[model samples]
Target: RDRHRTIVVGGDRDYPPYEFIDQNGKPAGYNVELTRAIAEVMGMTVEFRLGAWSEMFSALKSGRVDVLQGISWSEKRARQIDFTPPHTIVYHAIFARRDSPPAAGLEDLRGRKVALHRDGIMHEYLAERGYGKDLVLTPTPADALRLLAAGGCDYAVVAMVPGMYIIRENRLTNLVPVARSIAAQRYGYAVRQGDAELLARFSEGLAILRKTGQYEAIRAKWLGVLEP
Candidate 1:
């Protein structure tokens, strides 16, 4: 029972619009389709292990999955996991309560509370940039949103697309996006440090997806009309 036909792609399924359960009650989201296309480009079949982001990343580090798809980049994350060439980039945004001023820069958040996902690049960025006092690292983006919605914090830093999607989908009118930019974060699949073969396949497939219309289609599905 070798059972070697499918490679597992580990990721959180609740990241919504990007990756979430569809109307059919099965997994259907932008990243889900994107990963499947990447596997097809590599001439491989895939099995998705849906779970919390931390749990899925742990699976990649522990050799439980061949790849951890749809992750943002950071040097620290690269230490625990090897990443592929970036497939997409997201401009950062500060979502705050409707009446509050935005966090204009990293330092502007000092003394003001800001919530970010735990073990996520945003936390690392805030801590490394020396804003520990202003930061509240939550276990997930949803937690960050929950606290913000409850008026527990001054602001929440989140990726523009997913953050906006969550706000709108939840009918959260008080949460407003204040800033957006071409300055962005790159996302890629991650594997264990030693897995060069899997990494190579992922990069190759990503290249194919980018060159064809596949990546654009996926992006459009979630992002709507791309900003010029």
Candidate 2:
């Protein structure tokens, strides 16, 4: 049953407050702690591996990692990997200068310099709609947010939580969250396609965690509120 055996888990290494490299040079964040709790309940141990956000899929597909907790559900991704029932919802929005009129939606910034993570899901979504041809592509969400704060771009598109994390953690008071939001994605863990046994085990463990109230507790500790 591989009980008590160590499971290799990989996820975003630079996303703050959710998953990141701590001051001690170890994986530490909301997702990391949640994984720890779930592994404990399943009688398994977790060995953490940090990966670039763009590299997580290949790593999982190549068997370089057993599971990834930072992935969001997408049909394009679904063809290659299996995602568990989502553990939480992730919001996506645009951040702009506080003094600027709020962007009503993606079309509002059609001719503006928008900062986006290169090849990120946000980029893919926008590009698919022919909206990102003029975007300034960077490597991470933080980078995009930084560019926006520094006046290098008219807007920065990012996931709400991580964008807020970067702004709050770095004291980027000049930047403000626009009210407009995209259809939020459901966050979940991904495993190699057809790995039903591992997927089912994780799903069962997650259900137990939710039933025992542990899931809410973890979410509250990191995010301040639990959503339905």
Candidate 3:
């Protein structure tokens, strides 16, 4: 009965390689392409609602969107959202201004002014543990780095892959990613709880993509250069 409806997928528009609204202003990234490929085989029509990471998460929570194309998995999040098999592993790192003090890990930034994407995994991490007492909430990862470059915040928590990619894309040479990883998460699709049918479709679709060799190609096309 719902065959005619489109599956709405949401994602952060500023995260590169994984997902981003490209220079051409198109939704072009690994997640977008992978979801399209999945739709192609699963006979499902889909629409992308890529935008701010915070809003995208909220959209999914409010039932305004059907899926989140790439969200970090956590036990806390699992209570509210159901996730598909992870397609990639994401590691979070601390980024700081060239003049900022050294930070080997998350504890190093406790009570400091740290910039990071609002409502992201790191944000949750900080909020739960009383870290980043003066937390600077940013709309996107790049914005966090920009703020760090401008000395608006002491450091910014950014995913290593996209953090490095955005630094190059924006040419934020004043910033650097700390060698130590702050967090690592399973990056995958997330659907509203109790939406097992839709969740299963994506999980099976991902397996199909991986089995056909299409998944590796997609990974190479995007992450080949992004990965260090």
Q: What is the TM-score of each candidate against the true structure?
A: 0.88, 0.94, 0.92
Across 1-228, the per-residue lDDT of candidate 3 in tens digits comes to 495489998988888878888878889888999899999889999988888876776799898889999988888889999999898888888888777788887788877898988888888888898874689888888899999888888888888888888889888998988744556778989999999999999999999998898888888887533221
2 or 3: which has the higher lDDT? 3
Q: Highest lDDT among the candidates is held by which one?
A: 3
Once superposed on the true structure, which residue ranges of model 3 sit more than 4 Å away at CA? 224-228
TM-score pick, better of 1 and 2 = 2
Q: Candidate 1 clashing pairs?
A: none
For 165-204, candidate 1 gives per-residue lDDT tens digits of 8888777778887766524777768889978888888888
Among these predicted structures, which one has the highest TM-score? 2
RMSD of each: 2.6, 1.6, 2.2
Error of 3 at 30 (Å): 0.9
lDDT of 2 by residue, 11-63 (tens): 88888777898879999887888788888888777899987878877889989
Please list all clashing residue pairs in model 2, or write none if there are none. Answer: none
The residue ranges of model 1 lying beyond 4 angstroms of the native Cα positions read 1-4, 23-25, 224-228
Preferred candidate (TM-score higher): 1 or 3: 3
lDDT of 1 at 197: 82
In candidate 2, how many Å is residue 205 off? Answer: 1.0
State the C-alpha lDDT per candidate. Answer: 0.76, 0.83, 0.85
